[PDB]
């Protein structure tokens, strides 16, 4: 019957879900649980590099809050 066509669709459907699911998880793993920063324009890049210097550890995604201010 027609529903015997679905199992092929499920495999094809799952294979198109892995690339999207993998990229989202790998970014969070590599960016300390946050989305990967988006820097399309020079101003955004300048802030990101500044965050690298302010973190102490040379990482753009380690955010320092008020507790870092005297």
């Amino acid at each position: 019957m027609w529903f015997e066509v679905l199992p092929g669709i499920a495999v094809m459907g799952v294979c198109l879900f892995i690339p999207g699911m993998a990229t989202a998880r790998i970014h969070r793993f590599s960016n300390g649980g946050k989305e990967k920063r988006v820097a399309h324009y020079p101003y955004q890049w300048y802030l990101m590099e500044r965050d690298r210097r302010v973190s102490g550890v040379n990482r753009s995604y380690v955010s320092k809050g008020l507790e870092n201010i005297d």
Binding site: V5, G8, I9, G13, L16, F17, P19, G20
Partner: protein, 316 residues
């Protein structure tokens, strides 16, 4: 971790292409009152694997090509570019977050014509060359409408960034304000990928250019061709059927976005089973006399419509 990311994109693409062959053979079967593969594995789930092994242990021809170096360059270029067109796709986060991603996909897509042209030369057959020339003239003709239609849509979006199309459709699908463009974009994607009713290459009784290829080299052209069918339908869903993105639950986007991308890929198989084939002079007239006049007119309309409503999108 980025290298792991690339493999998490490439292998699933090839597996999806492998099982698209099965799904195509079974959807076509049921629309023809039959079943399709259901013997090689349960419901034909091992049919793709059998076909792959068979082709890769079958002796290849490699005739007396005029070059013998274009014969090996053509499938490398086809498959190499086909996988490259996936790296900027937001699903919902791109592997490579390009600022001009929409323009990157046009650029790489226009290079796929060389593999059609080079394989024509390598075959060394005068007739096989004629088939390559007709295929090339078809591809370049219909990417005129891909470029202008895309420009018209981006006038309602404001950038060439692919992830900005997600923001643009955060209140409503672009299929609603731009359905006339969606129609001519959908048909223009069939012609680009040599799909019925535009498959003169595979349309025997008039000609294909990849006729001298067998075994593994033939499968490489096949894999690239089908990966482009999935990619163009993923592009269409992003462009005209935007899926809402929740930053806390990105998997929700991927499931909804995949279902749309599958439904549009099955529409390609649906259209193959329903219509006869265009004549070469008739698909050219469908472009130079019907689509192009409307595409140019709609481009004028979409340059002016945002201005006269005060609806110009932000640059950023």
């Amino acid at each position: 971790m980025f290298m792991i990311n690339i493999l998490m994109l490439i292998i699933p693409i090839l597996l999806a292409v492998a099982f698209l062959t099965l799904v195509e053979r079974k959807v076509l079967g049921y629309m023809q009152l039959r079943k399709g593969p259901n013997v090689v594995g349960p419901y034909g789930l091992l049919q793709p694997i059998a076909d792959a092994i068979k082709l890769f242990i079958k002796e290849p021809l490699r005739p007396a090509t005029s070059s013998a170096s274009m014969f090996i360059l053509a499938p490398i270029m086809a498959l190499g570019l086909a996988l490259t067109m996936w790296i900027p796709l937001p699903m919902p986060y791109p592997l490579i977050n390009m600022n001009l991603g929409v323009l990157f996909m046009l650029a790489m897509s226009s290079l796929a014509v060389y593999s059609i042209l080079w394989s024509g030369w390598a075959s060394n057959s005068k007739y096989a060359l004629i088939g390559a020339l007709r295929a090339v003239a078809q591809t370049i003709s219909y990417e005129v409408t891909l470029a202008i239609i895309l420009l018209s849509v981006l006038l309602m979006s404001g950038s060439f960034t692919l992830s900005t199309l997600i923001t643009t459709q955060e209140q409503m699908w672009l299929i609603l304000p731009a359905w006339p463009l969606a129609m001519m974009w959908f048909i223009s994607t069939l012609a680009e990928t040599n799909r019925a009713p535009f498959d003169l290459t595979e349309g025997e009784s008039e000609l294909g250019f990849n006729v001298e290829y067998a075994a593994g080299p033939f499968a490489l052209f096949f894999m690239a061709e089908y990966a482009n069918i999935i990619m163009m339908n993923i592009f269409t869903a992003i462009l005209f059927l935007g899926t809402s993105h929740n930053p806390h639950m990105p998997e929700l986007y991927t499931i909804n976005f995949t279902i749309k991308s599958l439904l549009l890929t099955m529409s390609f198989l649906w259209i193959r089973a329903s219509y006869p084939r265009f004549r070469y002079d008739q698909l050219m007239h469908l472009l130079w006399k019907n689509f192009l006049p409307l595409t140019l007119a709609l481009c004028m309309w979409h340059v002016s419509l945002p201005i006269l409503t005060s609806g110009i999108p932000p640059q950023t």
